[PDB]
Every structure is written in structure tokens, then in C-alpha cells.
Amino acid sequence: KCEPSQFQCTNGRCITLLWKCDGDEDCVDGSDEKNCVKKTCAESDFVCNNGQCVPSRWKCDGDPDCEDGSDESPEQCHM
Amino acid sequence: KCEPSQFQCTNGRCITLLWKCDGDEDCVDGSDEKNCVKKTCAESDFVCNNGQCVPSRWKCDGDPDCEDGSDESPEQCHM
Amino acid sequence: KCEPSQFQCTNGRCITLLWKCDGDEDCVDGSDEKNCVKKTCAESDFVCNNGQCVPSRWKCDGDPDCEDGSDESPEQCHM
Amino acid sequence: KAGSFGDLQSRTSTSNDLYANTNLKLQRPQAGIVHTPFTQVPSGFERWK
Amino acid sequence: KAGSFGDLQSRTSTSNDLYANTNLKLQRPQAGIVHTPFTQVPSGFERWK
Amino acid sequence: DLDTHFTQYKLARPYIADCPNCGHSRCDSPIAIEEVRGDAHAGVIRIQTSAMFGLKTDGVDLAYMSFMNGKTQKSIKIDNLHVRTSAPCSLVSHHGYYILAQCPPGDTVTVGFHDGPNRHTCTVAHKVEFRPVGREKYRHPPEHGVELPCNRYTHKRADQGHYVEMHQPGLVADHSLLSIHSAKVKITVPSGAQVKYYCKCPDVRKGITSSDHTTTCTDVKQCRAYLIDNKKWVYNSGRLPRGEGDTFKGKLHVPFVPVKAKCIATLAPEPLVEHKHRTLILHLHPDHPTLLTTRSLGSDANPTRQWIERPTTVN
Amino acid sequence: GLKTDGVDLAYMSFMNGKTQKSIKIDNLHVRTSAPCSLVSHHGYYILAQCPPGDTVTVGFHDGPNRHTCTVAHKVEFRPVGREKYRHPPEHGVELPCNRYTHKRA
Amino acid sequence: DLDTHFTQYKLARPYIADCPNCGHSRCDSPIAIEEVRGDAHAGVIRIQTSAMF
Amino acid sequence: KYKTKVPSPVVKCCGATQCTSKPHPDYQCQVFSGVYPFMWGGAYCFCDTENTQMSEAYVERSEECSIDHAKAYKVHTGTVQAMVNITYGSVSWRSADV
Numbered sequence A, B, C: 001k002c003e004p005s006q007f008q009c010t011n012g013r014c015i016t017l018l019w020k021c022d023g024d025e026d027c028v029d030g031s032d033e034k035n036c037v038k039k040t041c042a043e044s045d046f047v048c049n050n051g052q053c054v055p056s057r058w059k060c061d062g063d064p065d066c067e068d069g070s071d072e073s074p075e076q077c078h079m
Numbered sequence D, E: 001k002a003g004s005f006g007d008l009q010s011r012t013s014t015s016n017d018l019y020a021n022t023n024l025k026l027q028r029p030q031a032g033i034v035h036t037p038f039t040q041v042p043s044g045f046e047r048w049k
Numbered sequence F: 001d002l003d004t005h006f007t008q009y010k011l012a013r014p015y016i017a018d019c020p021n022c023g024h025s026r027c028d029s030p031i032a033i034e035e036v037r038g039d040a041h042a043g044v045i046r047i048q049t050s051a052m053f054g055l056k057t058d059g060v061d062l063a064y065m066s067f068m069n070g071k072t073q074k075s076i077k078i079d080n081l082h083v084r085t086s087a088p089c090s091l092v093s094h095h096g097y098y099i100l101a102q103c104p105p106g107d108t109v110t111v112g113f114h115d116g117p118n119r120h121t122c123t124v125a126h127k128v129e130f131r132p133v134g135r136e137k138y139r140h141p142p143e144h145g146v147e148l149p150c151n152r153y154t155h156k157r158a159d160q161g162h163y164v165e166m167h168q169p170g171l172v173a174d175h176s177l178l179s180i181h182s183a184k185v186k187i188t189v190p191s192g193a194q195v196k197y198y199c200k201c202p203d204v205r206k207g208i209t210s211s212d213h214t215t216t217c218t219d220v221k222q223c224r225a226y227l228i229d230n231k232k233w234v235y236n237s238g239r240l241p242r243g244e245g246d247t248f249k250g251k252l253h254v255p256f257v258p259v260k261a262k263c264i265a266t267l268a269p270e271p272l273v274e275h276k277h278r279t280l281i282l283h284l285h286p287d288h289p290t291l292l293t294t295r296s297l298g299s300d301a302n303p304t305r306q307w308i309e310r311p312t313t314v315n
Numbered sequence G: 001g002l003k004t005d006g007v008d009l010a011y012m013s014f015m016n017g018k019t020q021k022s023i024k025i026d027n028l029h030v031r032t033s034a035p036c037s038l039v040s041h042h043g044y045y046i047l048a049q050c051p052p053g054d055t056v057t058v059g060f061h062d063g064p065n066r067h068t069c070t071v072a073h074k075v076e077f078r079p080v081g082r083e084k085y086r087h088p089p090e091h092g093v094e095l096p097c098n099r100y101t102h103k104r105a
Numbered sequence H: 001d002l003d004t005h006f007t008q009y010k011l012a013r014p015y016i017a018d019c020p021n022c023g024h025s026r027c028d029s030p031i032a033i034e035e036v037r038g039d040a041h042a043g044v045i046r047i048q049t050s051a052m053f
Numbered sequence I: 001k002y003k004t005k006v007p008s009p010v011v012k013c014c015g016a017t018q019c020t021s022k023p024h025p026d027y028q029c030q031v032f033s034g035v036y037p038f039m040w041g042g043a044y045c046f047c048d049t050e051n052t053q054m055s056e057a058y059v060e061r062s063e064e065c066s067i068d069h070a071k072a073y074k075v076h077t078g079t080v081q082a083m084v085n086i087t088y089g090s091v092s093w094r095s096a097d098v
């Protein structure tokens, strides 16, 4: 029951269109964070096992940088 | 030490007789609530097994209104 | 870097000589509470097994006055 | 005058003879508890400052 | 006058050039810690408001 | 070492005294606020209580405190010991009867500590205030400024020549050690406590016992009891009854004596001067109340003195 | 004081959604400008002794939830007599006043 | 998305800087309050520190 | 600034007590009758409605008197002296107080 530039979740409240799937639950159920697509990694970033984008400078640096610890694996880094 | 219309707790403090075992430990050691006889239950209420009284209307309503669950027992409710 | 009547710890901060292992770690690393000799106990006091000095009136009174309890042991007090 | 400047006079900081009139008046302890209440005028040194 | 109305004047809302006099003065750091203390008069836009 | 500072404090014990507004109804508190000192130049106060801090029956330790419930001294680890006036103060040190804290200004002084689910709070009315150093009335010590001579309570627990005295405790009345045996009252005395009694059931039967002494009268209401404990001394407060005989004086040192050190004061912003024929104009823009005092170098000084709070111009 | 089964003064009951929850009172706090000291509670009503200020808040910890509410209400300290004190003293002169009852009746 | 706003804060780290009035005597702490901004109309404020949240 | 010190009051349970005139600055002593005090663990004693509480008090100087205090002086006219810097001819500056 609001403007087309605004987004309405299932409760009845109307939020703006910039607040769709941006990260935070705005209304009670967070319906704006339920149906949204997932973007790709950058070309200059290395993708770990879980899909996190980390830069290639941090690759094989000796310290854990990814969630699964795949940045320091002997399989992906030839030792 | 005070008037017989005032109650004297065994520590030495004197309180009024309207405060006779009404629920709150008015003296320090709480000797006020220890010695007074128990009041009768209402005739229009269902007497629980633990001495509590719940309204008859609330009997066999599908909701446990008693502490021990004697208001929803299959021995006390014929289905 | 202070007067020879002042003391400096491994951090570099300068404190007075009266704060030399007095019990309070005045500077950050607390090296002032490290290297000093332990004082002697009084002759009028009773020495525990761990060295906690208690007065001789407190010996053999029926109450623990030491951590090890050597002031109330049957070896140190005939019963 | 007990409240302006000379309510506590001593000859030396380590002396042993003190003159002090501060209008100290004892008051009755009330309601059967063990305490000692009193009342007196505020110091003249803190008033002068 | 650095404290009344014109302590910060910009030609437009996004101009690169900016006039500002605020009596800003540097102060010496004290006792061997790393910080930069300064001293300046408060804003003229708050004082006008 | 710790034993040098805690030498005479080991001989002393806590006590229970009267505290107004302990909870809501001025009970007898294990920690009772006496003689708040608040006349430093940085808002740092020293509070003397009836509990004992930094002391345990077994040994000295800075993370253990001692207090009394009933007649038994209890030791509990310092877990949440808080001092608040209007905001929660940050306490500095504690040594025996005394607590040192850095408090914001206000009208009340409060202390409290928990052991289990208890609260053990005492509140005593006292007007503390922030006393700045210099000619500017700041409300908090600044990051930077000018050093000024100031006097503050030091956080060292040394002797420094100031002493307080401790006394033998007076008779303490305990009503929990009188009970009826079969039909007569019986006195239970723990570990040679030497319980005094006073019955007036048909007449006076005063006396001092040390073991058993089943009293030959009926009711527990018509007889009183006392307890002379002489193992540990107490500081002679005004909320405790005195002893009977002549009482010796102890020498307990006050730990946090006032000293004189250095304090940081705020520097005012520089004024803007404008010159006119025999006229000096100052455009003052201050953020705190600031003092401006002038004089003339002639035969008559003609002094002016005013506190500047708003931005004013003076000719 | 109500737990949906009987009477227990260490228990409280509230509603989240349409289910009448009931937990134990762990930290019920009322503050105005300093944390006040509670006196008693009975049903809908709380009684507390508060310093002066401009706001009245009360919250309770259910689980990891906070559950706080605040209302703007000016509460002042009212001295009795011909002197304007800011906290009731240890000793003085007893005068008649009017306060809310300690008891529930 | 949540990863879009953290694409440059990932590469940064907290630091330890001095601040007045830690406890009593102005230590060096991981928390260091700089530039409190209170030019709001509801009493709301924004605080910048040295830690990472 | 002064500091007032209160000793422990004596409590006579049923009787009378008196105090002497001790040498003290601003010494005060009183007797209050019929108090019936209430300590922790019951009343103090049994003798009803007549008792005695002394509650003496006296004043002394504070421990902050050694740090800040006001000194009272009476003046009387004395010497005036000055330091001069002088030179003459080809001799450089030399200073001495006169």
C-alpha cells in the first residue's frame, strides 16, 4: 500500500528499495533478506572452499586466511 | 513491651496486628508467619491435590491450571 | 634514565627506591617485585611449616590460623 | 568566631596545643539504635577558600 | 573573525577551495607519549546558531 | 613484602554496625560507611568501611576480602565490588578498612559486594564534588594542558606517620544461642566464648559462665545474653558500644594519606587582540568558565576580576 | 509473583507472541539517572526508590533477550520541612510525610 | 549484500594507541576513543575507536 | 580544616553513668536516659525504659593540615636589597648584589 519505489515485507511495513538483501534484517521476519541472488567473486581474488573472496597476495602466506583453511593447503600450494 | 493490639516478634520488634502472617516476613527472622492456622478454600472452586483452588470453569479445558497437573489428569477427566 | 636514587624497570619508566618490591607492581612488567631478599621473622611469633608468622597467643586455641594448619596439628600441640 | 577564619588555631603544624570552638552540640540518639549524632557549623577554612 | 560567522567559507557546497581561519595552534606533547595536541577557538556556526 | 603492610591489620577483624539506607529500611550492614574523605583536587575519594579488604583468615591476598555474618567471619573472593556516586566509579586500591576510588560528583556514596545471591549494600548521604586546579573550571581531567601543583591521595599503602587506634570489642548480644532444652532455657557457648547472662524471671540471676549452664527458668524472652570475644580487636567506631574496663590503644596506619604531586589543567584558547588609541580590545571565546584579571602598573592598580562563560568582548 | 500455576514471589510472567511465558526474576532493574533500589512488586505494579531525573526505564533479562522500555516522566525529590536536602539524613527531626505503602493489601 | 560493505575493512587491523583515563593512570589500550560526533538532534552519537567490530 | 572524632559510646543497661572534664579541644559530653538500643541479634539488654548512653565527642586537626594550610604572619619593616649589573671603561659586565 506504498509507493513502487518502496518495498513491503509480509507484516505490512514499507521499507525503501535500497534495503533489499543488503545484509540486515529490517522488519520482523527479514523477508528482504530471504529471496535475493548471490554475486560472484572478483577476478583479482582467490576463492576458498566455502566461496569467500580473498586477495591473491594473501595466498600461501603461512597464516590462515580462509574459513576452511584452504589458503595454506599442500594440495592447492605445491610443496 | 508494646500494646497487646500490636504483635511483638521474638527479636524484640513490635508490629501491628493487621500484619499478622499476611505473607511478608515483617520481622527479621520471620517468626510472624510460622504460627497461624490455615484459611478455608472457596466452595465454588475445585480443590487441587496440593491445596490450591482453581475455578471450576477451568477444569478439563485442555490447559494445566494446577501445579501438579491434577486438573488435566485422565483419572480426574473422563474422555 | 633518572637519578641513581631512582629505580627503572625493564620497560624504561623510572620509579623511586621506596617502591622496590613493596608488594605493588608500580610499572608495567612488574620486574621491581622480582629480585630482593626475604626478611626474617620475629622471635616472638610462631613459625608455620610454610613460613606464615602468627603470634604465639594464637597457638593451641582450637582455631586454624595458618594455611597448612601446623599451629593446630597434634604433632605441634600435645593432646 | 567559629565560622570565618579562626575556628581552629595551632601555633605549629607539629604542635600539641589546639584552640578550636566549632559550636559542637551533641544530639539524642533516636529510635533505639547505637550511634552518636552531633551538629556543628561548617569549617571557616573551607568558607574562606 | 574565527568565531562569529565566517570561520569557514566555501564558494559552493562541493568546492575544492576553502577559506578557514580558526586560531589553530599546535601544543607540545607531554611526558613522552605520542599524540598531537592543538588549541583553537570553537566554531562560529554553532555560536551563531 | 605484603607482611610489612599487613602486620597489625591481621590482628583486627570486621564488625557489623548501623548503616542508614542499607536496603530500604536501614538494617545492620556487614559493610558500613564511615568518614568519607573527598577533599582532593581530582575527584578522588577515600572511603572507610567496616569490612576488611585484602585479608583472608588463612593468609594475605589482594583478591580476597573478609566480612562477618552473625558471629562467624567469612572470606569471599572479590568478584563485584562497586562504588557509585551517580555513575559507577573506578576504584583504585583497597587495604584493610579503606577503599580508594575516583568518583564523579553527586550527592550520595554507595558501596556493595556479592558473595552468592546476596546484595550487601550501604548508602550514606555525602556531597562530593569535582575540584579543578587553576583558574579554569573544567569538569574532567583533560588530555593535555599545563601541569599545576595539586594534592591527591596516593595509592601506596605505606605508613607515612599517620595512625588510627583499635580497641577491644564491647559485649555483643546474640539471641541465637538461647534455646529451651526440655522446659527450661539452655545456654550454648561455642569454643570458650564465655557467654554472659542476665535473667529476671522471678529475680536477678546475673553471672558469667563458660560451659553449659542450663538456666532454671521457663521463657527465652525474659533473659538476655552476651559474648566476650577477645581474640581480635576492632576499630572504635561511634556505632559500637564501649567496653567495661580500661581499653588499650592500638596503632593502625592510614594507608592512603594525602600527598602533593602534579595535576593537569586546561589551557584557554588565545584571545584576539585589537589595538585602539589607549584601548585594548580582547575577543574572548572560552569553552569553560575562565578567569580574567587585569591591573594597572601605576600608583593605583584599579583591579578587575570577572568569570567569562559566554563569548564576550572586553575593552 | 505469578507463574501461571500458583503464587511464587521469585517468578514473573509475560507474553511473547500469544504464548504466556513464565521465567524466574534474575535481574529486574529500574533506573532514572542512577540504578534505583526496588522495594516490592505485586501483579502489574512495581515499587522503587529512585533519584531525580527525566526518564523512567525498566527491563528484564529473559534469556539472551534484553526487553527494555523507557518513558519520559519527570520525577523530583521532595524534601519535607523548611530545609531543602537532597537525600534523607541519618539523624534529624521526625516530621509527618506521605509515602506509598510497604505492604500489599 | 553483507560482503559488499566489508570489502575494504577486511584488509585492516586494530591497533593499540594511548588514551587518557583507562583506570586511574592513562594506559595504552586496544580501545581508544577518537572523534566523538554528537551534532545530532535526538541525542544519538557516533564513536570511532581502534578496535574492530 | 578540622576533623571531629567520636569515641565509642558507653551503654549502661540499668543504672547511671557520669563523665569527667577531660583535657581536649572542644570537648563535649552528655547523658541520655531511656534509650533501649537495638543491635543485631535482638535487643541489647533487659532493663526496660531506663538506660544511659554517654556519646562523647571532641575535635582535632585533620591529616590534610600538613599539605595545605594558611600561615598567619605579622610583618615589620626590614631590609631592602638589590642586584646590580655594572661596567666601566674597557671592563666587561660583572654583577653582585648590594
Ligand SMILES: [Ca+2]
Binding pocket: A019, A020, A021, A022, A023, A024, A025, A026, A032, A033
Ligand atoms: Ca535489509
Ligand SMILES: [Ca+2]
Binding pocket: A058, A059, A060, A061, A062, A063, A064, A065, A066, A071, A072
Ligand atoms: Ca593465506
Ligand SMILES: [Ca+2]
Binding pocket: B019, B020, B021, B022, B023, B024, B025, B026, B032, B033
Ligand atoms: Ca507478616
Ligand SMILES: [Ca+2]
Binding pocket: B058, B059, B060, B061, B062, B063, B064, B065, B066, B071, B072
Ligand atoms: Ca484446566
Ligand SMILES: [Ca+2]
Binding pocket: C019, C020, C021, C022, C023, C024, C025, C026, C032, C033
Ligand atoms: Ca614494587
Ligand SMILES: [Ca+2]
Binding pocket: C058, C059, C060, C061, C062, C063, C064, C065, C071, C072
Ligand atoms: Ca590456633
